[PDB]
Every structure is written in structure tokens, then in C-alpha cells.
Amino acid sequence: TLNGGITDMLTELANFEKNVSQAIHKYNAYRKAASVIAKYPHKIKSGAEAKKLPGVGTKIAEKIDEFLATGKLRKLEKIRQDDTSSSINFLTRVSGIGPSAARKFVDEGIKTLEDLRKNEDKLNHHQRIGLKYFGDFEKRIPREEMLQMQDIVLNEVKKVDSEYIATVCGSFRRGAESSGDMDVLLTHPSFTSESTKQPKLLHQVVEQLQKVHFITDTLSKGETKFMGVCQLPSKNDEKEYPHRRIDIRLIPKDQYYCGVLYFTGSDIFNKNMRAHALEKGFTINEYTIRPLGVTGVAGEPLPVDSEKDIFDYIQWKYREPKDRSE
DNA sequence: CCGACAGCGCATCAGC
DNA sequence: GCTGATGCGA
DNA sequence: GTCGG
Ligand SMILES: O=c1ccn([C@H]2C[C@H](O)[C@@H](COP(=O)(O)NP(=O)(O)OP(=O)(O)O)O2)c(=O)[nH]1
Ligand SMILES: [Cl-]
Ligand SMILES: [Cl-]
Ligand SMILES: [Cl-]
Ligand SMILES: [Cl-]
Ligand SMILES: [Cl-]
Ligand SMILES: [Mg+2]
Numbered sequence A: 001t002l003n004g005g006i007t008d009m010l011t012e013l014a015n016f017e018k019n020v021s022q023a024i025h026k027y028n029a030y031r032k033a034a035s036v037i038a039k040y041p042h043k044i045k046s047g048a049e050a051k052k053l054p055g056v057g058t059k060i061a062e063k064i065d066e067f068l069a070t071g072k073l074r075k076l077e078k079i080r081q082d083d084t085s086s087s088i089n090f091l092t093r094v095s096g097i098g099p100s101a102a103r104k105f106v107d108e109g110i111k112t113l114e115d116l117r118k119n120e121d122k123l124n125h126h127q128r129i130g131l132k133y134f135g136d137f138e139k140r141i142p143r144e145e146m147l148q149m150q151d152i153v154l155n156e157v158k159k160v161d162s163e164y165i166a167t168v169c170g171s172f173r174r175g176a177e178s179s180g181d182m183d184v185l186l187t188h189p190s191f192t193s194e195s196t197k198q199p200k201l202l203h204q205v206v207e208q209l210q211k212v213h214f215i216t217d218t219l220s221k222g223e224t225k226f227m228g229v230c231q232l233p234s235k236n237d238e239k240e241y242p243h244r245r246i247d248i249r250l251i252p253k254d255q256y257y258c259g260v261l262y263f264t265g266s267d268i269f270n271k272n273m274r275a276h277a278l279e280k281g282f283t284i285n286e287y288t289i290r291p292l293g294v295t296g297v298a299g300e301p302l303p304v305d306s307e308k309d310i311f312d313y314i315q316w317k318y319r320e321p322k323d324r325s326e
Numbered sequence B: 001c002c003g004a005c006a007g008c009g010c011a012t013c014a015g016c
Numbered sequence C: 001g002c003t004g005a006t007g008c009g010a
Numbered sequence D: 001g002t003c004g005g
């Protein structure tokens, strides 16, 4: 939080470019800068100082000087006063409503939480659940609760088949004291890059979690990725816990390490690592790390037996999960 | 300058 | 029904 | 918006 003021500004700018301008690259440019500045171990005294960092160019350097001097950014001050921008930014906060649907809804006069509620009919399934739990999905999950949730998930999974391995990844695995949601990497020996000897592997787990009333709603669901909602059980006379978002990813067991690396993130860390990979001549996804031929075409999967092996291929020293929070 | 910017699963749609 | 483009989110 | 060649 040394440069909290500056990172918030850059984040707001990023959200504006993504939600309103629908300019994704500007979105990522701003996020990269906020990220590199978030880890800068000094209290930034000037844009020039910030420009030293990779990701911070002339435009952001100027904005930082304006922020350090006045404590604000006129450009943002103006964005905040624009109704269309305010409405669009707001609507995108509903899970399932992106920049397009948000701008679309505004054209139709649907601009507030109140409007969304009297217009459920105009929403798809995902947007409907997002609206339903709008408030809850805003709340962070104390790690203490993450521990309880982990307990339930691992124990319920074990009950379906002792051969399943469920690993909580995301910010939890990185040691965060609070998480935005719970991310679970799932594996089962029957499902490998070689074959799927058992269908419904993801379904069965979802089913079991719904049975014990842990999973309450489903945003989306396929053979390998589940996007849903869950809730910790509460005691008698005790107020109910907020509903939580839960993501589950079923990955071939022989590709666990590439899968655990991906799902542990962060997303910016993954973006930096994959980009670095390309430069070194490799391509990395959640399943494998492949070399890039002279043509650019990816080759065959390289042997991987630990997260570290992936780091070695691209000539990167190993970084513990707790240090991948970019 | 100018092309590149990480990679991909699920939902939904147009075109056939 | 299929396939491919697009939105959305991870 | 920023970067590398
Ligand atoms: O754009 C994305 C989003 C997510 N991911 C990966 C990394 C991230 O850590 C993981 C889980 O996604 P979340 O959106 O749940 N983020 P995370 O768990 O890191 O943080 P939070 O506490 O917000 O959930 O998926 C990407 O690679 N790219
Ligand atoms: Cl852009
Ligand atoms: Cl401001
Ligand atoms: Cl692997
Ligand atoms: Cl692959
Ligand atoms: Cl995912
Ligand atoms: Mg998460």
C-alpha cells in the first residue's frame, strides 16, 4: 500500500478502458503498470521515477505527476461525472454482464440495480445468478472461511472416489489472507491426456456437492470447467454465511503441474510468464509447455514433473506461489 | 514506426 | 443439427 | 499504453 493512491488510479483507468472504451490492450497496459508499481519497494516521488519501471511509459508518468501534485486525476474526475460511463462501469460489476451487454442495457434504459431486478426476463442464466448474489459476490472471503470450505470440498470429493485429488489454487494457494472466490483444481487417474476412461468425472463431484447443499447455483458447466456458487453451512440461530463463487477445473492427471501453475496465478503473473516463455521460444498453457518451431508452430509437449521444471525451461528461477501475486 | 500484447472453456448466436 | 465468431470470465 | 527490434 506504499503507492496505494497511484495503483488505485491506474486500476480505475484500466477498468474504464475495458468496460467503457472496450480497449482491452489499454486495459492490460494499465494493469501491468499498477502491478509493477504495487511491488516497487519505494514510495514513488515522481512520474520520472515511475517511468524507470517496465510498463510505465510517458503517458502514465504524466498522470502520476498530476496525481502526486493534486491528489487526483482530472481525466478520472470527468469520467466519474459521465452518466453513461458510470452506468456502464456499474452494470459490468454484475457477473455475466460484460462491456457489450452493459452498454446494450444502458441503451435500453436499464441502468440501475433496481432496473435489473424488474427486468430479470431480459437476462441470461449467468447474469441472473450474478444479480441474485450481487452483494455477496462483492464480499471477500476470510482465509479462515476458505479453510472450512476446503475441508468440505476435499472431504466430499474423497467420498465420491478416494482416487480424486482436489487442490485449492488461486489466491488461496498463494497464501492470501482473503480471497475473491474459491478455485479448485481437480484430477482423477481415469482422465489423462491419453484417454477418458470415465465420463461425468466433473458432474459427479458437482452433484455430490449439491447433495450436501454446498453448491447452490450454477453459472456455467461443462466437462472440465464448472463456474458456480456455494455457501458454508451455519449453526443454529447463527446468521447465514454469504454465498460464494466457486470455480472447479478438471485437468488430465498427467498434466497436473501445468494445470496447478496456471490456476495458482496470478493472472498477471501468468501473463508475464507466458510472454517471457514466447521470448525464450516456448508456449505455455494450462496443459503443457511446447517449443516454438522455426515457423512459429508449437511442437510436442515437453516432459514436466514439477512446477519448477516449467520455470527451468524458460530460464526463470523458481518462484513460490506466495511470490506470484502480481 | 509498428506489430505484438497469454491462453482457453462455456454460453450464445448467425449462417448453413 | 453443425461450425465458426463473439461475449464473458477464469 | 508500452514495449522491442
Ligand atoms: O485472466 C485470467 C484469469 C484467471 N487466470 C488464472 C490465474 C488465477 O490465479 C486463477 C484463478 O482465477 P481468479 O479469477 O479466481 N483469481 P485469483 O484466485 O488469483 O484471485 P481472487 O482472489 O480474485 O480470486 O486463474 C488466468 O490465468 N487468467
Ligand atoms: Cl486497446
Ligand atoms: Cl482521481
Ligand atoms: Cl504437467
Ligand atoms: Cl496443449
Ligand atoms: Cl479456468
Ligand atoms: Mg480466485
Ligand SMILES: [Mg+2]
Pocket (backbone or CB within 6 Å): A170, A181, A182, A183, A246, A247, C010
Ligand atoms: Mg475463480
Ligand code: NA
Pocket (backbone or CB within 6 Å): A050, A051, A052, A053, A054, A055, A056, A057
Ligand atoms: Na518505463
Ligand code: NA
Pocket (backbone or CB within 6 Å): A091, A092, A093, A094, A095, A096, A097, A098
Ligand atoms: Na461483469
